Coordinates of C-alpha atoms (C1' of nucleotides) and ligand atoms in Angstrom, one line a residue:
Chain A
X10 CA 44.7 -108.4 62.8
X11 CA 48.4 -107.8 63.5
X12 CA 48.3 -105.3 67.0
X13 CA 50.8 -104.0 68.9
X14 CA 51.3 -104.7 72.3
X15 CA 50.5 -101.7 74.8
X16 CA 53.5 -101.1 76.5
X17 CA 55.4 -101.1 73.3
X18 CA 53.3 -98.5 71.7
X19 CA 53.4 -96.0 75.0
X20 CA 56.7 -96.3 75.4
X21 CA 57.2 -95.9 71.5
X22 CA 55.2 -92.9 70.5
X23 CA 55.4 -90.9 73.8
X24 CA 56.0 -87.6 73.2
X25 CA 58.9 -86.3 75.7
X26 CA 61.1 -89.3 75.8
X27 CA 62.6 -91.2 73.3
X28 CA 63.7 -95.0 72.0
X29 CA 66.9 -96.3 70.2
X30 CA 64.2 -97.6 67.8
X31 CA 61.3 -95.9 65.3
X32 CA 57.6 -97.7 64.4
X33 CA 55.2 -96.3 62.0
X34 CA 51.8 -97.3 61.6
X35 CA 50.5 -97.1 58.4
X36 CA 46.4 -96.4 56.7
X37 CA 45.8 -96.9 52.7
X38 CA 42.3 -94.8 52.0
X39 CA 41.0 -95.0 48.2
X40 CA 39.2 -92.3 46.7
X41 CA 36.2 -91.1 45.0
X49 CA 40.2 -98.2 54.1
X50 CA 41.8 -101.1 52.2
X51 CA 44.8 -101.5 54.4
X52 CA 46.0 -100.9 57.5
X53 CA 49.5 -102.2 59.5
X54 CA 52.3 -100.8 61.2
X55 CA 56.3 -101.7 61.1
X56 CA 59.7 -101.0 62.4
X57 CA 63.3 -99.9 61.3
X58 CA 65.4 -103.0 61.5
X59 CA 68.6 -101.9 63.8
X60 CA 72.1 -101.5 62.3
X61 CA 74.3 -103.7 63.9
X62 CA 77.8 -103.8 62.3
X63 CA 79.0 -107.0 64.8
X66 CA 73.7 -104.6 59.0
X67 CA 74.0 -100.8 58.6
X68 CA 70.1 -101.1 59.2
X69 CA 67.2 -100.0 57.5
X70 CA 64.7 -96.8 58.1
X71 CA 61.5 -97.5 59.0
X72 CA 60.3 -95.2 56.0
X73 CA 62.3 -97.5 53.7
X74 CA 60.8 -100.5 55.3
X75 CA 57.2 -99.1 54.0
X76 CA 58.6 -98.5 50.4
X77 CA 59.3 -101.9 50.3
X78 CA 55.9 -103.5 51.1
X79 CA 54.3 -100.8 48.8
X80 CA 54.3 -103.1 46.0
X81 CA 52.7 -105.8 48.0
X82 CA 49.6 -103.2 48.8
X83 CA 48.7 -103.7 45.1
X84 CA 47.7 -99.8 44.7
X85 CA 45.8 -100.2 41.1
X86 CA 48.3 -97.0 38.8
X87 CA 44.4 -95.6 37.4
X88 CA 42.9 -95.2 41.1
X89 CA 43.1 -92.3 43.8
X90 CA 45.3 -93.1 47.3
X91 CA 45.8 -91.3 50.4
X92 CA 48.9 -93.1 52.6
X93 CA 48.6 -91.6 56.2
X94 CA 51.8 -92.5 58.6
X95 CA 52.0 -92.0 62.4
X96 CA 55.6 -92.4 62.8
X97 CA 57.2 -92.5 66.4
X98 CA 60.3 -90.1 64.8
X99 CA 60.3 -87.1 62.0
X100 CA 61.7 -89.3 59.1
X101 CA 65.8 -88.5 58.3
X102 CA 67.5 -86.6 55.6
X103 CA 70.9 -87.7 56.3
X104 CA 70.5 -91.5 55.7
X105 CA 68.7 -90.6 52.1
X106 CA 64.9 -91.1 53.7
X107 CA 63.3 -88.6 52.9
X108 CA 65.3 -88.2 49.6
X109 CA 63.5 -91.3 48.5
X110 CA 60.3 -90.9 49.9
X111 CA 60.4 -87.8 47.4
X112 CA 62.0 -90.0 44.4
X113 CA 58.5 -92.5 45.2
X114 CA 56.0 -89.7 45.1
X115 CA 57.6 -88.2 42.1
X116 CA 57.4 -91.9 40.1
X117 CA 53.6 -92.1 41.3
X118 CA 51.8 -88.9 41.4
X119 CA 48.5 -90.8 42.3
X120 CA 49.3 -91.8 46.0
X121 CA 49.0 -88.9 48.4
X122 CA 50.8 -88.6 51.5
X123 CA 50.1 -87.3 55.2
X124 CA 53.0 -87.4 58.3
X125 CA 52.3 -87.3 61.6
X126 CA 55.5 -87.4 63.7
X127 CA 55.2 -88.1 67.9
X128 CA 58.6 -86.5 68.1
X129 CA 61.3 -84.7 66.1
X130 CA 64.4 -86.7 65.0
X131 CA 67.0 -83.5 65.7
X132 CA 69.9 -85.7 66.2
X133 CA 70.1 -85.6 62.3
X134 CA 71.5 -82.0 62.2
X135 CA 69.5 -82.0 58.4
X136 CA 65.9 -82.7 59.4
X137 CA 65.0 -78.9 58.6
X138 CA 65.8 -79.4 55.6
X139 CA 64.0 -83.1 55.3
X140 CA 60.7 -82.0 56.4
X141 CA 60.7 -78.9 54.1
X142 CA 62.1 -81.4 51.2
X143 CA 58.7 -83.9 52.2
X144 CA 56.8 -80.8 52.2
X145 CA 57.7 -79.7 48.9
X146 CA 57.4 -83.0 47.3
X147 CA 53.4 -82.5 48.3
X148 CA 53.5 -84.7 51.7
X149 CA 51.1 -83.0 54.4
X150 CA 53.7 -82.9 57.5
X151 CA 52.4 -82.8 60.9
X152 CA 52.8 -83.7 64.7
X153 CA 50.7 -86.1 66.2
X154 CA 48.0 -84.9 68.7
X155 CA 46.0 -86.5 71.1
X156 CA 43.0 -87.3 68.3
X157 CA 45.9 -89.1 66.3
X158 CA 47.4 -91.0 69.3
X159 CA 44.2 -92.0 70.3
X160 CA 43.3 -93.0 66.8
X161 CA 46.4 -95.1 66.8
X162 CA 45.7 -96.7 69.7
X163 CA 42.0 -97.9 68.6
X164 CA 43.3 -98.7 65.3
X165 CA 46.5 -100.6 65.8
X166 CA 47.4 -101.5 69.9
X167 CA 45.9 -104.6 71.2
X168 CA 44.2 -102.8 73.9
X169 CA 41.7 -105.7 75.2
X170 CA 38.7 -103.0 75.4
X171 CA 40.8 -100.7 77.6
X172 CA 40.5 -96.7 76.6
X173 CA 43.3 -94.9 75.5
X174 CA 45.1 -93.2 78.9
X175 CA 47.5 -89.9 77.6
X176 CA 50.6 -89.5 79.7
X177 CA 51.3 -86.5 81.8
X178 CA 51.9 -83.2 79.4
X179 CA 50.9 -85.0 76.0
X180 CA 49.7 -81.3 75.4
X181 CA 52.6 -79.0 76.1
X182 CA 55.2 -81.4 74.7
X183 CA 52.6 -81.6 71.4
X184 CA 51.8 -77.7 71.5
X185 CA 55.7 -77.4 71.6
X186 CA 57.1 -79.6 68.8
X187 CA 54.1 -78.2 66.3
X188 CA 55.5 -74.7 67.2
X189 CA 59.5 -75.8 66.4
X190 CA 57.6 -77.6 63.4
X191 CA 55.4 -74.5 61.9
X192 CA 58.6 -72.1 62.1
X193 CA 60.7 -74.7 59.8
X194 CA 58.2 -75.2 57.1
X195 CA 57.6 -71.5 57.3
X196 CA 59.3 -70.4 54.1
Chain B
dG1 C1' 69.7 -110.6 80.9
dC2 C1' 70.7 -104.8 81.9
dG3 C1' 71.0 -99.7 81.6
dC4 C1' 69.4 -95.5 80.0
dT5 C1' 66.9 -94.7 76.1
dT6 C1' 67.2 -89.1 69.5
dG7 C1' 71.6 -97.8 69.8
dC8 C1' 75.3 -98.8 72.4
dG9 C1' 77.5 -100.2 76.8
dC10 C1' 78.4 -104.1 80.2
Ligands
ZN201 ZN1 65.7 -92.2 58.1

DNA sequence: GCGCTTGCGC
C-alpha cells in the first residue's frame, strides 16, 4: 500500500535515458507473495558518502522476517545494474553466501557502465547463484501493476522500449558468457 | 527553485 508515483517510475526505469538516482522494487515469494515494496539509494552528499540502493534492501532484510528452515525467492527490478566498485555486489555475494536458502533474480532497466568494473560485478552476482537479467516489457509492465499508483490507467511503453531492451540483453549475454 | 540527467552546477 506504499506506490510510486507515475512520473517518477517512467522517468526512473526508462530504458535509454538515465537519472542521477537508482530505485528497486522488490517481491519476497515462499516456496513449496508475502512481501512486496520498493526503495531508493540515499544520495552522497559530502556538503553522506551515500548508500546503494542494493545496500538499502540488505538492511530491511531482517525486518522481512524470512523464517532460516523455509524456501525464498527475492526478485528485484532495479532502475541501474548494481556496482562493483562501491563493494555492492561484493556484499550482495557475502549475504547469499551466509543464507543459502533465499534465492535471488535481477532485472536491471539499464546498465550502470560508468563503474568501469560492472563486467566483472554481474559475472561475480552470477556466480554467487543470482539469475541476472534485463527488464523487458512483461517486467516493466509488471512493475507498473504491482508497484506505480497508476489510478486504473494501463501501462503506456515509451518509444523503442524494444531495441534499447534487445540491445542491453545482447551487451548483457556476451559478459556473462564465460 | 533549475538544468541536464550513468549527482553536480548555478
Ligand atoms: Zn552500488
Amino acid at each position: 500500500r506504499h506506490l510510486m508515483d507515475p512520473h517518477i517510475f517512467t522517468s526512473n526505469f526508462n530504458n535509454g535515458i538515465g537519472r542521477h538516482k537508482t530505485y528497486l522494487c522488490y517481491e519476497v515469494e515462499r516456496l513449496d507473495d508475502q512481501h512486496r515494496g520498493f526503495l531508493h539509494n540515499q544520495a552522497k552528499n559530502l556538503l553522506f558518502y551515500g548508500r546503494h540502493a542494493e545496500l538499502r534492501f540488505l538492511d530491511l532484510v531482517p525486518s522481512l522476517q524470512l523464517d532460516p528452515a523455509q524456501i525464498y525467492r527475492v526478485t528485484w527490478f532495479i532502475s541501474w545494474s548494481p556496482c562493483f566498485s562501491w563493494g555492492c555486489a561484493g556484499e550482495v555475494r557475502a549475504f547469499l553466501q551466509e543464507n543459502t536458502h533465499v534465492r535471488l533474480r535481477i532485472f536491471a532497466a539499464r546498465i550502470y557502465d560508468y563503474d568501469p568494473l560492472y563486467k566483472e560485478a554481474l559475472q561475480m552476482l552470477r556466480d554467487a547463484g543470482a539469475q541476472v537479467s534485463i527488464m523487458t516489457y512483461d517486467e516493466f509492465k509488471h512493475c507498473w501493476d504491482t508497484f506505480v499508483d497508476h489510478q486504473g490507467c494501463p501501462f503506456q511503453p515509451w518509444d523503442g522500449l524494444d531495441e534499447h531492451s534487445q540491445a542491453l540483453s545482447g551487451r548483457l549475454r556476451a559478459i556473462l558468457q564465460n
